[PDB]
Design a protein around this ligand. Structure first.
Ligand code: HEM
Length: 153
């Protein structure tokens, strides 16, 4: 469980993310694909992008980044009371896209990296710890929902 103060640190940084959702999302997906190239293979619509510049120019990757961050943000804002937000995400990600939890770990590392890179002054050790705990809670709860659907990834 996170403390109220941990939630507040999470939400304080997230408000900085919301000043430029698209740009944060591009930076996070690009970092994910740079750091863990296997993850790009799950995206039929993006795996043809061969260079960082092509990835930045891609309207569809940028749109997808906003979709991703909007969903994550809606989950974080519920401060752990996220069943209704999380269920549909678990359904698609378990049964259609087939995203293992290790891949959710990789995108969590990309989120942390981008947030620190863009907001170091609002993303020191206590705020990083709080964000890591919020993302761990989300991954724990998504894994339980994966198993309820029969997916052991
Ligand atoms: C913070 C973590 C993530 C969030 C909040 C998230 C959110 C979303 C949302 C909202 C969609 C659109 C609706 C749906 O199909 O569920 C989506 C689609 C998708 N996600 Fe994720 N996602 C996350 C992580 C990942 C990761 C790590 C992968 C792959 C390594 C992945 C692969 C996909 C694929 C392949 C689609 C369909 C893309 C398309 O063709 O339109 N997701 N995701």
């Amino acid at each position: 469980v996170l403390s109220e103060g941990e939630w507040q640190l999470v939400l304080h940084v997230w408000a900085k993310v919301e000043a430029d959702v698209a740009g944060h999302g591009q930076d996070i997906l690009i970092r994910l694909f740079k750091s863990h190239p296997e993850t790009l293979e799950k995206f039929d619509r993006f795996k043809h992008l061969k260079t960082e510049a092509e990835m930045k120019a891609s309207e569809d990757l940028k749109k997808h980044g906003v979709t991703v961050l909007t969903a994550l943000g809606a989950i974080l804002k519920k401060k752990g009371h996220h069943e209704a937000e999380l269920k549909p995400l678990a359904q698609s990600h378990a049964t259609k896209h087939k995203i293992p939890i290790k891949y959710l770990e990789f995108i969590s590392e990309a989120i942390i990296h981008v947030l620190h890179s863009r907001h170091p002054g609002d993303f020191g050790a206590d705020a990083q710890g709080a964000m890591n705990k919020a993302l761990e809670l989300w991954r724990k709860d998504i894994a339980a929902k994966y198993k309820e659907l029969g997916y052991q990834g």
